[PDB]
């Protein structure tokens, strides 16, 4: 299986994405540019459709859900294994605030 | 309990990234994405059973099998020791989240 | 001695004043320094070599592609000048000192410049060619500084090779064949596979002795940081800058170091 964010602070994701191989969730045919802030996470949601929903990417991450569409991404509870979201810290504080998985965890 | 790892390892990775930036300026990025020496990310899955519930188990590069490395950057050792060290914490958090969802 | 007053005196005075005045904020400071350097346009060859110093790295970065369009964002005129993938490499072989040599040495293009490690090898080869070209323009006291910088780069590359890049085919022979007193006695670092061995190799040069020290910092980094950090620490020697001598390279290095320090400051 694969695991990547590609919706993140660029170097922060690249520090654990691809150095020895696998092209960060097979960038040759999958994945996306790890740099965020170019647009909303609507394109990140589409990439999740193209990476996480593609039965390859298992774990995903959105930095503190700053623009991750917390309500939209909260629907990933169904089929949790291919949509294991995360809320990394650094350049945005990790909080139990509204997000994809932590919002349900708040219940 | 493991949520605090996502802050501690993130702070360590940020410090390593700042050190690498001070060392070599802008990272190569692009073709190899730079910023790391370890973490040839590939994930393997296992299914454990607790009280009749098929709780999944997760392993991946830098947090289990399917890991590889080659060369690295200037602070690539420090980057691996901080940025790639968060991989184990992330894998543990993902396994815990999947187990919690299945149990719920 | 009278040639300084014959020509170049005003430019030297302007450079000295600008250096004495020196001490997105980092980006703004870098842009200001680059503008000051550009507005200053014998010494032309020195300025060209100084620019080509960072232009080698700029061209190496531009050689990618693979998100190659992002190189325009870092188009700093100090090092990322437009004038300074084998088909495009042949076109880029002009207007650069190290480019004609790298055309033959790196004729494999991406094969010998793989982004994992071989791209760093091509960058090191280009840096070695540029250092050789700069050392060719002898006649001033800057030859010692250039030799020290090249020695620091070579020793840092050798230390990185012996630490972990030995498994990446950066063997003892590659410590000078690919990894860019060093121009004559670099063979002592071919067997310095340990930090203690690195200190012992550094003991061969009493000035380089005690520079490594515990080697917890500086030498801990790979690529060209091990002995380059020693040069950064000893850059107080460059701070002397005796008059009536080529100090444009020293001022450029001081400005680059100040920019790096400002970047390292960041959010305190």
From TrEMBL, chain A:
Stated name of the protein: V-type proton ATPase subunit F
GO molecular function: proton-transporting ATPase activity, rotational mechanism
GO cellular component: proton-transporting V-type ATPase, V1 domain
Source organism (scientific name): Citrus clementina
Residues of the full protein shown: 12 to 118 of 130
UniProt KW keywords: Hydrogen ion transport, Ion transport, Transport
Family per similarity comment: Belongs to the V-ATPase F subunit family.
Quaternary structure note: V-ATPase is a heteromultimeric enzyme made up of two complexes: the ATP-hydrolytic V1 complex and the proton translocation V0 complex.
Transmembrane spans: none
Role noted for this protein: Subunit of the V1 complex of vacuolar(H+)-ATPase (V-ATPase), a multisubunit enzyme composed of a peripheral complex (V1) that hydrolyzes ATP and a membrane integral complex (V0) that translocates protons. V-ATPase is responsible for acidifying and maintaining the pH of intracellular compartments.
Residues in coiled coil: none
TrEMBL record, chain B:
Protein name: V-type proton ATPase subunit D
Shown residues in whole-protein numbering: 53 to 156 of 259
Family: Belongs to the V-ATPase D subunit family.
Record organism: Citrus sinensis (Sweet orange)
Top-rank lineage group of the source organism: Eukaryota
UniProtKB/TrEMBL annotation, chain C:
Topology with respect to the bilayer: Peripheral membrane protein
Any Gene Ontology CC annotation: proton-transporting V-type ATPase, V0 domain
Compartment(s): Vacuole membrane
Sorted UniProt keywords: Hydrogen ion transport, Ion transport, Transport
InterPro entries (alphabetical): ATPase_csu/dsu_sf (IPR036079), ATPase_V0-cplx_csu/dsu (IPR002843), ATPase_V0-cplx_dsu (IPR016727), V-type_ATPase_csu/dsu (IPR035067), V-type_ATPase_csu/dsu_dom_3 (IPR044911)
Top-level taxon: Eukaryota
Gene Ontology molecular function: proton-transporting ATPase activity, rotational mechanism
Classification via Pfam families: vATP-synt_AC39 (PF01992)
Main localization (coarse): membrane
Record's subunit section: V-ATPase is a heteromultimeric enzyme composed of a peripheral catalytic V1 complex (components A to H) attached to an integral membrane V0 proton pore complex (components: a, c, c'', d and e).
UniProt family annotation: Belongs to the V-ATPase V0D/AC39 subunit family.
Function: Subunit of the V0 complex of vacuolar(H+)-ATPase (V-ATPase), a multisubunit enzyme composed of a peripheral complex (V1) that hydrolyzes ATP and a membrane integral complex (V0) that translocates protons. V-ATPase is responsible for acidifying and maintaining the pH of intracellular compartments and in some cell types, is targeted to the plasma membrane, where it is responsible for acidifying the extracellular environment. Subunit of the integral membrane V0 complex of vacuolar ATPase. Vacuolar ATPase is responsible for acidifying a variety of intracellular compartments in eukaryotic cells, thus providing most of the energy required for transport processes in the vacuolar system.
Protein name as catalogued: V-type proton ATPase subunit
């Amino acid at each position: 299986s694969a695991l990547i964010a590609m919706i993140a602070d660029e170097d922060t994701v690249t520090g654990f994405l691809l150095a020895g191989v696998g092209n960060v969730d097979l960038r040759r045919k999958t994945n996306y540019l790890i740099v965020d802030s170019k647009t909303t996470v609507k394109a990140i949601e589409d990439a999740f459709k193209e990476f996480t929903t593609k039965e390859d990417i298992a774990i995903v991450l959105i930095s503190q859900y700053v623009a991750n569409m917390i309500r939209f991404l909260v629907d990933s509870y169904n089929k949790p294994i291919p949509a294991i979201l995360e809320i990394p810290s650094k350049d945005h504080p990790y909080d139990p605030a509204h997000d994809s998985v932590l919002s349900r965890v708040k219940n | 309990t493991t949520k605090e790892s996502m802050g501690e390892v993130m702070k360590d990775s940020s410090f390593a990234l700042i050190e690498a930036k001070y060392v070599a300026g802008e990272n190569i990025k692009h073709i190899v994405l730079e910023n790391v020496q370890n973490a040839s990310i590939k994930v393997r899955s296992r299914q454990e059973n607790i009280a009749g519930v098929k709780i999944p188990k997760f392993e991946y590069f830098t947090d289990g099998e399917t890991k590889n490395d080659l060369t690295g950057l200037a602070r690539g050792g420090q980057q691996v020791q901080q940025c790639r060290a968060a991989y184990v914490k992330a894998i543990e958090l993902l396994v815990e989240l999947a187990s919690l969802q299945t149990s719920f | 001695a009278m040639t300084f007053n014959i020509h170049g005196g005003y430019l030297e005075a302007i450079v000295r004043g600008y250096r004495a005045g020196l001490l997105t904020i980092v980006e703004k400071c870098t842009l200001k320094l680059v503008d000051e350097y550009k507005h200053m346009l014998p010494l032309s060859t020195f300025l060209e070599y100084i620019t080509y110093g960072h232009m080698i790295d700029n061209v190496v970065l531009i050689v990618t592609g693979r998100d190659v369009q992002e190189l325009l964002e870092k188009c700093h005129p100090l090092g990322m000048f437009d004038s300074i993938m084998r088909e495009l490499y042949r076109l880029v072989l002009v207007d650069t000192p190290l480019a004609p040599y790298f055309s033959e040495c790196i004729t494999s293009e991406d094969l010998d410049d793989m982004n994992i490690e071989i791209m760093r090898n091509t960058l090191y080869k280009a840096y070695l060619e540029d250092f050789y070209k700069f050392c060719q323009k002898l006649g001033g006291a800057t030859a010692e500084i250039m030799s020290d910088l090249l020695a620091f780069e070579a020793d840092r590359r050798a230390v990185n090779i012996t630490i972990n890049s030995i498994g990446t085919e950066l063997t003892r022979d590659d410590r000078r064949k690919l990894y860019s007193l060093y121009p004559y006695g670099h063979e002592e670092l071919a067997v310095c596979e340990d930090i203690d061995q690195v200190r012992g190799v550094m003991e061969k040069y009493p000035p380089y002795q005690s520079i490594f020290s515990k080697l917890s910092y500086g030498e801990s980094q790979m690529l060209d940081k091990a002995f380059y950090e020693e040069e950064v620490k000893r850059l107080c020697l460059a701070f002397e800058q005796q008059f009536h001598y080529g100090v444009f390279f020293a001022y450029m290095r001081l400005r680059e170091q100040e920019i790096r320090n400002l970047m390292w400051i960041s959010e305190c």
